[PDB]
Design a protein around this ligand. Structure first.
Ligand SMILES: Nc1nc2c(ncn2[C@@H]2O[C@H](COP(=O)(O)OP(=O)(O)O)[C@@H](O)[C@H]2O)c(=O)[nH]1
Lengths: 428, 41
């Protein structure tokens, strides 16, 4: 019951998809062999949300790795946890993608959709009652941004009732990991405004400072940033996989979050986060977690809460704690700094809780907030897009794949119609 | 033979449709699934 299915499309998706399944595999006490080696029966109770019982008592994931140029898959096929995947759940094409939205969405994408859909349905029926999908993106690239949305446009039409989350990694504000980041952003965002129920936005910039300032790390490898992304993605299903004195399923999280069908761009964080030294200084109490989670640093996205107004918010605590504390805390926050919140919503937070913390900790939290400062990223990018599209730089690459110019202006206007949605509801 | 020249020459629905009638639909039946789709499987 409440089965999920996980998609990993792209180089980022295939890589953070590794660390993700590395965390959950530990959380349920299973070894890279695929066998269970935990202690409690509680591990095996809701394991079927992410895995599939096999012969001889194995548990293999239900992920789908799809990517052109299987190079980066040859890595995860050779990592420590590379033995758990079904080799059949690997979709790859012998051609490069070129960091180009077009061929990842029109030419090369269309040659693999026959396989990917034949793959997703092999397990969308292995679920007794499917809860919803869950993907990982890289909006700058061509595989994750072309095949990603192309698959979504297919997912939305055969399974509209179900829910699809999206941990999309957005372009950075200051540095640009790609020169054609704008075109790949808008053309994808336009796809996400119509075919997405929820969509977190994570930026590689904020992940660095959090790994620099708060975590005091010296050399933050991408293996470390994904120990963060994995932490929050695991923090959403704790109500699904584990008991809780106030559970909160995946659906009741959106209903309670997006007031309008378009404003599904959220902002996340994780607590606690301390260096190896400061662990011995600061206590682990509910007022601590809520002090760091509401901060403007733990926001994995590069959007400042102190500029816009929180439409709604969330919090998923994990640990045997006192549910009075969480309720009075989240009330005080809205009470004191009562200008960051809109007024036509009396109480605009939800607060889950779970009897089960992570495997190494005793108390943890997890934050999701739907602010109006998210309009800033779509403003910063809608300026860079219209800057170079005005002179038609790098366009002979896109138009060479049967694209047009209406497929551009449509993408831009549909984004500008979204930036106004985030302005009306900002009454300062 | 009986002098019966008058008797010599002889000169003389939709089934229904029951009310209960109906095609079985994949509902009101606990044995099987409860949906109908074009090309799911
Ligand atoms: N958190 C994390 N992000 C990555 C990593 N590698 C690449 N990214 C992002 O992936 C983006 C480029 O998209 P990519 O998936 O690599 O190429 P694509 O196959 O065409 O989609 C860049 O913005 C990278 O910053 C990683 O190892 N960890």
């Amino acid at each position: 019951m409440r089965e999920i299915v996980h998609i990993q499309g792209g180089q980022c998706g295939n890589q953070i998809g590794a660390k993700f399944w590395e965390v959950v595999s530990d959380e349920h006490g299973i070894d890279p062999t695929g066998t269970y080696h935990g202690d409690s029966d509680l591990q095996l109770e809701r394991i079927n949300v992410y895995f599939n019982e096999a012969t001889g008592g194995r548990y293999v994931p239900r992920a789908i790795l799809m990517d052109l140029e299987p190079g980066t898959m040859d890595s995860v096929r050779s990592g420590p946890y590379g033995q758990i995947f079904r080799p059949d759940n690997f979709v790859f094409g012998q051609t490069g993608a070129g960091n180009n939205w077009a061929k990842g969405h029109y030419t090369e994408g269309a040659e693999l959709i026959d396989s990917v859909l034949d793959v997703v349905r092999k397990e969308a029926e292995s679920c007794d009652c499917l809860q919803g999908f869950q993907v990982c993106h890289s909006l700058g690239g061509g595989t994750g941004s072309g095949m990603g949305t192309l698959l979504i446009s297919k997912i939305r039409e055969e399974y509209p009732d179900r829910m699809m989350l999206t941990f999309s990694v957005v372009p950075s504000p200051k540095v640009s990991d790609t020169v054609v980041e704008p075109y790949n952003a808008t053309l994808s965002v336009h796809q996400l405004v119509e075919n997405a129920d929820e969509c977190m936005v994570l930026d590689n910039e904020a992940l660095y400072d959090i790994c620099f300032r708060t975590l005091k790390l010296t050399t933050p490898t991408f293996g470390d940033l994904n120990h963060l992304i994995s932490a929050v993605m695991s923090g959403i299903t704790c109500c699904l996989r584990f008991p809780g004195q106030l559970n909160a399923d995946l659906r009741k999280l959106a209903v309670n979050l997006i007031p309008f069908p378009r404003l599904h761009f959220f902002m996340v964080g994780f607590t606690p986060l301390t260096s190896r030294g400061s662990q011995q200084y600061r206590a682990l109490t509910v007022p601590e977690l809520t002090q760091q989670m509401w901060d403007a640093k733990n926001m994995m996205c590069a959007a400042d809460p102190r500029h816009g107004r929180y439409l709604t918010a969330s919090a998923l605590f994990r640990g045997r704690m006192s549910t009075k504390e969480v309720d009075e805390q989240m009330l005080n926050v809205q009470n004191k700094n009562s200008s960051y919140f809109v007024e036509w919503i009396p109480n605009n937070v939800k607060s889950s809780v779970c009897d089960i913390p992570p495997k190494g900790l005793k108390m943890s939290a997890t934050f999701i907030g739907n602010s109006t400062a998210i309009q800033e990223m779509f403003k910063r990018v809608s300026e860079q897009f219209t800057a170079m599209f005005r002179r038609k730089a790098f366009l002979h690459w896109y138009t060479g794949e049967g694209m047009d110019e209406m497929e551009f202006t449509e993408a831009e206007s549909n984004m500008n119609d979204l930036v106004s949605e985030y302005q009306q509801y900002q009454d300062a | 033979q009986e002098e019966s020249v008058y008797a010599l020459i002889p000169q003389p629905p939709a089934m229904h449709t029951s009310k209960f009638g109906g095609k079985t639909h994949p509902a009101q039946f606990d044995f099987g699934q409860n949906k109908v789709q074009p090309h799911a499987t």
